[PDB]
Amino acid sequence: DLKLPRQRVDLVAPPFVHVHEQATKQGPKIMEFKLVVQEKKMVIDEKGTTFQAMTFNGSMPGPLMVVHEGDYVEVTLVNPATNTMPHNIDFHSATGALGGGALTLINPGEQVVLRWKATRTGVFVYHCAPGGPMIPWHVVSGMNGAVMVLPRDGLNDGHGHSLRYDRIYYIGEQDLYVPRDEKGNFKSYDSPGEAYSDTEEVMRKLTPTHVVFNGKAGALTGKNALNANVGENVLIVHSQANRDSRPHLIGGHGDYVWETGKFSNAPETGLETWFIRGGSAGAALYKFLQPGIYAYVTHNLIEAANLGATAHFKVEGKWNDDLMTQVKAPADIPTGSTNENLYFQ
Amino acid sequence: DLKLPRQRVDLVAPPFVHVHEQATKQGPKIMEFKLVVQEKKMVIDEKGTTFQAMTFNGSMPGPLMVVHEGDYVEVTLVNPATNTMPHNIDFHSATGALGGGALTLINPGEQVVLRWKATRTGVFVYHCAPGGPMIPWHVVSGMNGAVMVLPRDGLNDGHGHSLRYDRIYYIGEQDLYVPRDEKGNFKSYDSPGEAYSDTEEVMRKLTPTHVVFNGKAGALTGKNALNANVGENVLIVHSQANRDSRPHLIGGHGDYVWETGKFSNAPETGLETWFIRGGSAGAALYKFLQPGIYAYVTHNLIEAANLGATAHFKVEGKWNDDLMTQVKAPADIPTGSTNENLYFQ
Amino acid sequence: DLKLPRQRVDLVAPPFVHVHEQATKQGPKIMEFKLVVQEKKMVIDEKGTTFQAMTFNGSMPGPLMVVHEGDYVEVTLVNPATNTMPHNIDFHSATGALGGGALTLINPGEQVVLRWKATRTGVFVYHCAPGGPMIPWHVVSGMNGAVMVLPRDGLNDGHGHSLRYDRIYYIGEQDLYVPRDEKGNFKSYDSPGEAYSDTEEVMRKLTPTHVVFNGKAGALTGKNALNANVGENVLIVHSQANRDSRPHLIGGHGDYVWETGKFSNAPETGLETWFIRGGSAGAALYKFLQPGIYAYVTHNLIEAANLGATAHFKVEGKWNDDLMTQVKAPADIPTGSTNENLYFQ
Numbered sequence A, B, C: 001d002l003k004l005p006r007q008r009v010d011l012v013a014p015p016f017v018h019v020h021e022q023a024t025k026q027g028p029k030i031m032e033f034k035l036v037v038q039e040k041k042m043v044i045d046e047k048g049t050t051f052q053a054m055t056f057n058g059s060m061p062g063p064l065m066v067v068h069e070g071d072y073v074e075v076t077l078v079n080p081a082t083n084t085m086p087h088n089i090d091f092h093s094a095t096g097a098l099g100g101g102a103l104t105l106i107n108p109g110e111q112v113v114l115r116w117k118a119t120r121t122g123v124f125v126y127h128c129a130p131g132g133p134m135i136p137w138h139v140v141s142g143m144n145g146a147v148m149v150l151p152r153d154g155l156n157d158g159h160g161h162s163l164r165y166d167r168i169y170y171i172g173e174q175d176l177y178v179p180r181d182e183k184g185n186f187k188s189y190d191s192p193g194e195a196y197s198d199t200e201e202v203m204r205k206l207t208p209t210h211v212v213f214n215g216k217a218g219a220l221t222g223k224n225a226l227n228a229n230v231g232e233n234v235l236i237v238h239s240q241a242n243r244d245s246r247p248h249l250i251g252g253h254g255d256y257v258w259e260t261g262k263f264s265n266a267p268e269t270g271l272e273t274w275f276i277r278g279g280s281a282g283a284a285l286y287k288f289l290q291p292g293i294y295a296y297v298t299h300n301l302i303e304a305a306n307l308g309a310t311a312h313f314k315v316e317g318k319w320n321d322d323l324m325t326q327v328k329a330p331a332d333i334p335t336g337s338t339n340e341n342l343y344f345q
C-alpha cells in the first residue's frame, strides 16, 4: 500500500559517503539499501595485531546511509551462511521494535527486509543487537555504523541561514577489547566464538586496548589521509556506538557543531573540542583556512597517540600569514636574556 | 517568622513519584519532607550478590522530591540509632552551607531539620556528604536521590509552548564497587565498616563492578517493567551522583531533553542518546508512538547488558506500520542472489 | 608589515590571572607573552609524593593568557638548556600548523617566536605536542594551560545583556599517572626520561593515580583557599587538556555556564554540575549569595576526595536565613516518633 518511487542506493566504504543531494525538491521516496554481515579476521593496529571482527558490509564502521526527512528506508539485511552467529540491526533513527532489532534477527543463511520512516533529522548510530550480552559483544566487535537524515532543505545554522558542505567524511570510532596473554602480548583466535570468553573479561573492565578510526590504527594517516582544500566547508560525521569520544581538529575548529547530532537543534559555533556520547553520532562543519597537515583526534591524547585514534587531513592551498606566522625561527637563547629573574624561578 | 502554609508530602519508593501538580496557582508553601537513613545489606544483582548499602528511606536511589519554584523545602533528616555511622544531606538545588551538608551532620540516634528555598528550577541530585573520603563512600554505597523543582507554570519547550507529562518515572543510576576475592568472586561483609577498606581499593581504580537502576540489576525488567501507553508523554528523570551516564530509549527518542537538567534552559529536541554528567540529574520527555517492549539503558552497552544497567518499558497500544514494518520476514537468501559481487568482498 | 601597537603582558601563577580589561575600546594590538619550559620534580599530593613534571613557566597548569578578539598574540617560547627534551606549543585558539605546534619545536637551548591571530572567542587549552607518543606524555606531565579570548565588549548572557565579573580564577585540572612498585607505593625517578617507560604503562590503562587542581592535592585548600565576598560575580575558568571533568561548586551553582567554553554561544543558566570535555576549557560565572566555605570539585567524588580534586572558596559576608536555615539543630529522635511505620521498613 505504500505507493512511493523506489530508489536503490549503492553504499561505499567509509570514510567516503555515497552520493546524495543536500537540499532536494524531490518528494519522499523508498530508499533501498542492502547490508551484508561479514564476520572475518581483521588487522587493527600498526604492529599487525589481528582481531575477530564482525561487520556490516566488511568495514568498521559500517557504511554511512544518507536519506532525507520523510523518506522511508527499506533495508535488506543479509546474514550469509559463511557466518557463524545470528545478527540483527537497530537504527537509532527509527521508531519502534527496539529500533528494528526485534524485527530483523536472522540466522546464517537468512535475510530480512525492514522498512522505517525517517521522521527524525540528524546523524544516528545503527548497530547489531541480538539480545543480552551479545549486544555489547557484537557492537564492540565492529557491528555499528551511522545513518544521516538530512532536512529536505539541507543543513542550516539554526539562525535561518543555509549551510552547504563541499565535502563529507564519516569517521567511525571503535573501542576494541583484545585479550592479552600472561606476557602482555595480544592473543589471536580462530573464530569469534573462540575469542568470546577472554574478550568479555576485557570488556568487563571497561578499558579498551585500542581506539581506532575506520577500523585500524593508522587507517586514515599516511597514504589514506583525508583530502581537502583551503576554502572548502567539510562536514565530519563522527559516531561511537558504545563509548564516549571528544573529537578535535588539531589546527582547526568546529565552525558549526551538532555534538548531540540532531539537526532540529541549532549547532554551537567555534568549538575547540566536542563530545560524542557513546551510543550516538554527531557532526561538525569546518571551513579550512590554512593548508597543511591536520590531525583529527579524540582529545584523550593517550587514546589518540597510543591506542590508535588519530586521522590526518592533508589540505592544499596557500598559507595565510595573517592568521599565523613564525615570526622568528628556532634560534639559540640570546646570551643577554634574563630568564633567571622570572617570577616562577 | 516564615509565615507560609505548611504541606506534608509522603514520599514513595522509586521509580514512582509522589503525587504533585505540574502547573499550580498555589502560592509558595513550606513543603515538609522526612528522610530516614537506613544502613542495610541489599541484593544488587541477578546472581544474588549482596552489598553493604546505605540509603535514604531504604531505597537506591532515595525518593524523588517534587516542589515548585519559590517553595521552601523543610527536610527532617533522621539517623536511627540502629545505624553505625554519622550522615548528613547536601541538596544540589539549595544555596549555602555545602548544599545543607554543613548544617545536617547527625550521629545515630539524632535528627535535624533543614530548610532551603527552591530558587532554582530543574532536577537536581541530593546526597550524603559527611566529610573527606566518607563523601564518595556514602554516595556510592547508595546515599543519593534527586529533587525536582518545577516552574509554577509547569514545563515548557523553551519556545513558549507548555509541555505536560501523563506519567513520570525516576531512574536513579548507581555505580557500585564490590570487592572480589583472589578467585574473582564477590566478597560479603557483615557491616559497612568491615567492607570499607576493600571497597575503597576498588573505588580508587574508578571502574564499577555493577551499574544499576533502582538499586539492582534487573530491578526494572521482568514483572517490574515500567508501564506506558501509546500516545502518553512520559517524563524520565535520570540521576547519577558520582559518575557519567548516557541514557538511551531503545526504539524511541528523547523528544525534549534537558540533559544538564535545568528548566531555565530550552531542551534539545529529537535526541538519540543524552548525557548525565556525574553529580547531576537530567530529564527527557518522550511521547510513545509504538507499543511493545523498550529497553532503557546507559549506552555503554557493556554497562547496560553486563553490569546491570537496563530497564524495560512495556507499552500497550496499536502498532503503526507506517513508522516501521517488517516488509519480509526472515527467509533463506535467494539462490539467485549475487552478493559475491559486492564492493567489499 | 603588521603595524599595530605592541603590549607586553607579564603572566602570573595560577589560579590568579594577569590584569586585563573586560570590555575595551582599544583597537587590536600585538600582545606579547613569554613562556619558558621548566622540567622539574614537583610534589603532587599531601603525602609528599614527587613526580617528574614538565611545565610552562614552572606551574601546573601553565598560566592563563588573556587577550581580546582580533588581537594578535606573539608568544616567545623558550626551552632552556637545563631541560632535557624538545618542546613546542599548540594553541587550540589558533588556526593552522597544528595550532602552532608545527612551527614551535625547539631543542634545549633554543627559543622560537609564534604569532597567531585571536579570531575565535572563548577559553581554550594550550599544550605541548612534540609528536607521536610524546604528545600525551608531555601533556600529562604538566605541559598545558589555557588562553581566554574575550569579546571586545566583554562577556554577555547570550540574550543581549552585559555580564561583568568582579573576580576571576583559573582552575587547571591535571590527570597524573604515577607508577607504583610491587608493594603499591609510588615510585620516584631522577629524571623524566627515566620515568617514561613505567609511566607510559600506567597511561595505557587510562586510569589516573591523581587528579589535581593547580598541580597538587590540597593546592587550593587550607591557606590557599580562593577568596570571595557575598555579592561578587566570580568567573571560574576550568581546563582539562587530556581527560573529561565535571565541575561542581558545592553549596553554589553555575549562574551562567559555557561548558564548551566559547563565547559566541549563549551560556546555560543555573547548572548544578557542568562538563569539561578533555582537550578543552570551559567557564562558569557565579554570584555568591552566602558566606562560608565552598568546595569546588569534579563530581566524580572519588576523584574529588580520594585522588586530589578539591578546591575551596572562603567567602566573607552575612548569612541569608531566607535561602537556607537550620530550623532545628541535631537532637535526639523524639521518644514519641513513629518511624517504624514508614512505607520502606
Ligand SMILES: OC[C@H]1O[C@@](CO)(O[C@H]2O[C@H](CO)[C@@H](O)[C@H](O)[C@H]2O)[C@@H](O)[C@@H]1O
Pocket: A097, A102, A103, B291, B292, B319, B325, B326
Ligand atoms: O499486542 C499485540 C501483539 O502484536 C504483536 C504480535 O507479535 O506484534 C505487533 O508488533 C510488531 C512489532 O513489534 C509488529 O510487527 C506487528 O505487526 C504488530 O501486530 C506483538 O508484539 C503483540 O504481543
Ligand SMILES: OC[C@H]1O[C@@](CO)(O[C@H]2O[C@H](CO)[C@@H](O)[C@H](O)[C@H]2O)[C@@H](O)[C@@H]1O
Pocket: B097, B102, B103, C291, C292, C319, C325, C326
Ligand atoms: O562569620 C560569622 C560566623 O557565623 C557562623 C557561625 O557558625 O554561622 C553563619 O553561617 C551558618 C551557615 O553555615 C548559619 O547557620 C549561621 O546562622 C550564620 O551565622 C560561621 O559560619 C561564621 O564563622
Ligand SMILES: OC[C@H]1O[C@@](CO)(O[C@H]2O[C@H](CO)[C@@H](O)[C@H](O)[C@H]2O)[C@@H](O)[C@@H]1O
Pocket: A291, A292, A319, A325, A326, C097, C102, C103
Ligand atoms: O605547499 C607549500 C609548502 O610550503 C611550506 C614550506 O614548509 O610552508 C607553508 O606553511 C607553513 C606553515 O605550516 C608556513 O610557515 C609557510 O610560510 C608556508 O609557506 C610547506 O608546508 C608546504 O609543503
Ligand SMILES: [Cu+2]
Pocket: A054, A086, A087, A088, A128, A129, A130, A138, A143
Ligand atoms: Cu551481530
Ligand SMILES: [Cu+2]
Pocket: A090, A092, A125, A127, A279, B248, B250, B299
Ligand atoms: Cu543502540
Ligand SMILES: [Cu+2]
Pocket: B054, B086, B087, B088, B128, B129, B130, B138, B143
Ligand atoms: Cu551517609
Ligand SMILES: [Cu+2]
Pocket: B090, B092, B125, B127, B279, C248, C250, C299
Ligand atoms: Cu554533590
Ligand SMILES: [Cu+2]
Pocket: C054, C086, C087, C088, C128, C129, C130, C138, C143
Ligand atoms: Cu613538552
Ligand SMILES: [Cu+2]
Pocket: A248, A250, A299, C090, C092, C125, C127, C279
Ligand atoms: Cu590539543
